[PDB]
Amino acid sequence: HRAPPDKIAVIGAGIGGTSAAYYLRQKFGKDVQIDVFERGEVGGRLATLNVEGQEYEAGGSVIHPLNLHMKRFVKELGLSVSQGAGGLMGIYNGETFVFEESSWFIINVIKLLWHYGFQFLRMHMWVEDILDKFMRIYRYQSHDYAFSSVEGLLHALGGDEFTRMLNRTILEALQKAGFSQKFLNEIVTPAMRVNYGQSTNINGFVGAVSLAGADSGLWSVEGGNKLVCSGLLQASKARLISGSVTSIEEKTRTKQTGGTVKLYEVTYQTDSGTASDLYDIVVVATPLNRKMSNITFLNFNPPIPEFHKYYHQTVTTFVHGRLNASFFGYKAPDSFTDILTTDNPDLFINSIGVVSPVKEKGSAVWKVFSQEPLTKEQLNLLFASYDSVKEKKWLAYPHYKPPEKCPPIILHDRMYYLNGIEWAASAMEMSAIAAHNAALLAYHRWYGNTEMIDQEGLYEKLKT
Numbered sequence: 001h002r003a004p005p006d007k008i009a010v011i012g013a014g015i016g017g018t019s020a021a022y023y024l025r026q027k028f029g030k031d032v033q034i035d036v037f038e039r040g041e042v043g044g045r046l047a048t049l050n051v052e053g054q055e056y057e058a059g060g061s062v063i064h065p066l067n068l069h070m071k072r073f074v075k076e077l078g079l080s081v082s083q084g085a086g087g088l089m090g091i092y093n094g095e096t097f098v099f100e101e102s103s104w105f106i107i108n109v110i111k112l113l114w115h116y117g118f119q120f121l122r123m124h125m126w127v128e129d130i131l132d133k134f135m136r137i138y139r140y141q142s143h144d145y146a147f148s149s150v151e152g153l154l155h156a157l158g159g160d161e162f163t164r165m166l167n168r169t170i171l172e173a174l175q176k177a178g179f180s181q182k183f184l185n186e187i188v189t190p191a192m193r194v195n196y197g198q199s200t201n202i203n204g205f206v207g208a209v210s211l212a213g214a215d216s217g218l219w220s221v222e223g224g225n226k227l228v229c230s231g232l233l234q235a236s237k238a239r240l241i242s243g244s245v246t247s248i249e250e251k252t253r254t255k256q257t258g259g260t261v262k263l264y265e266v267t268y269q270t271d272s273g274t275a276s277d278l279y280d281i282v283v284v285a286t287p288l289n290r291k292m293s294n295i296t297f298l299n300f301n302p303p304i305p306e307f308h309k310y311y312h313q314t315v316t317t318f319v320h321g322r323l324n325a326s327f328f329g330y331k332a333p334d335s336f337t338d339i340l341t342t343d344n345p346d347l348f349i350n351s352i353g354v355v356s357p358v359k360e361k362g363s364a365v366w367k368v369f370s371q372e373p374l375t376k377e378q379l380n381l382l383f384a385s386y387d388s389v390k391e392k393k394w395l396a397y398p399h400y401k402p403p404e405k406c407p408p409i410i411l412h413d414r415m416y417y418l419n420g421i422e423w424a425a426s427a428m429e430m431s432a433i434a435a436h437n438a439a440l441l442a443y444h445r446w447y448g449n450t451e452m453i454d455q456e457g458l459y460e461k462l463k464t
């Protein structure tokens with residue numbers, strides 16, 4: 001038994017930050033002060049963007065059914081789900097379509113059998129086994145077990161298989177599993193491009209998450225994914241502070257009872273000028289690039305270990321206007337919503353797809369993933385006409401460079417960093433798992449419940 005903490009800072013009003021605030025509240029009780037910093041708008045990558053009067057998801061867009069944190073949250077917050085359908089889908093290689101979906105599902109079955117055989121089925125079954133192991137996390141989190149390291153977490157779910165996938169490229173992985181060069185370049189690679197704007201040179205684990213994201217049932221939050229952030233924030237009853245955190249420094253206190261412990265001074269800038277406050281615990285729920293969150297770490301002993309890592313640029317470009325169906329090879333096209341690309345370096349886009357707005361109400365609204373800002377020439381070559389154009393540059397996810405070691409969860413004595421998780425998978429639910437885990441870990445670390453940390457073979461014992 002020990003003194004419960006007075007103040008906790010959470011840096012970042014992301015889905016990660018606000019999820020932390022929520023779970024912290026659940027572990028430390030109503031008493032503890034929780035402050036969430038946000039230099040920008042709540043939601044971070046779950047922003048929207050106004051296009052001819054309506055809001056569209058510009059960052060985090062869809063949510064899988066096995067995203068239980070987001071499911072439980074939308075339920076608890078009483079938000080509505082925009083579980084819509086989609087449309088038609090094709091893969092372009094820079095000459096023609098290696099594959100196009102038909103209106104008859106049986107046609108599609110036939111096409112995919114001829115072109116790929118059972119590889120469609122076999123990937124499914126390989127992915128299910130990965131997912132199935134991964135779902136163990138919920139049971140462990142519902143029983144409050146924590147993990148000090150993204151690797152250790154994965155190990156606890158899938159054992160060595162999962163830690164080896166992290167160090168493998170999803171290409172290596174699927175070749176070792178006997179998937180064909182054809183299927184890898186025609187199916188798998190486009191999926192990587194659309195999802196993570198990178199090729200099959202990304203973490204096997206990320207990649208398998210990616211491939212479940214072609215599973216069906218998908219949905220989004222009606223009104224914006226970013227509502228989930230503000231909704232949790234409210235429901236956690238944390239104090240939201242608009243300011244760009246600049247610096248974080250250890251100090252020593254003096255508990256009335258002659259204490260001598262280590263606090264963290266967080267300095268942040270606002271309109272008015274500089275301001276600061278002292279915290280017993282810190283959770284960083286933003287990436288630690290100097291381009292993404294300029295926090296300086298002062299007088300630490302020992303120094304925070306190396307989270308130095310780089311994210312990948314993806315530009316979401318929205319266009320109200322009609323496509324150039326002839327730029328993909330149609331001439332007189334009888335009658336055609338999403339185009340994915342193969343890894344052809346003559347292409348300048350990752351994907352291009354008609355979108356619906358967040359609210360629920362040709363020449364329509366399109367969404368273009370590109371590595372770089374689209375030039376006038378490329379917009380013109382892309383669309384016949386366009387009334388309006390909107391574009392956000394998004395350090396969106398890691399530049400997965402396997403083999404590599406995920407950034408720590410523990411930066412210091414009582415300072416935790418959840419965005420390490422991205423290097424296993426960048427997704428909404430992944431931020432939620434990390435936040436949950438980060439909260440548990442901090443709690444167990446504060447109260448010294450070492451029986452609850454880094455416990456292996458949990459699933460067996462927890463299994464009936």
Ligand SMILES: Cc1cc2nc3c(=O)[nH]c(=O)nc-3n(C[C@H](O)[C@H](O)[C@H](O)COP(=O)(O)OP(=O)(O)OC[C@H]3O[C@@H](n4cnc5c(N)ncnc54)[C@H](O)[C@@H]3O)c2cc1C
Nearest residue numbers: 012014015016039044045059060062245286293396427428
């Ligand atoms: C283009 C795109 C598409 C995506 N599509 C999907 C998808 O289809 N499905 C899915 O599940 N996920 C998707 N994601 C991921 C989704 O956005 C998740 O939210 C993501 O894993 C975490 O992003 P975040 O900013 O919400 O969280 P975090 O990165 O954990 O939160 C970062 C927060 O910290 C704040 N911050 C930064 N610096 C400071 C500072 N100095 N002081 C205070 N606050 C600071 C930021 O403003 C932000 O709010 C997508 C992301 C992008 C960019």
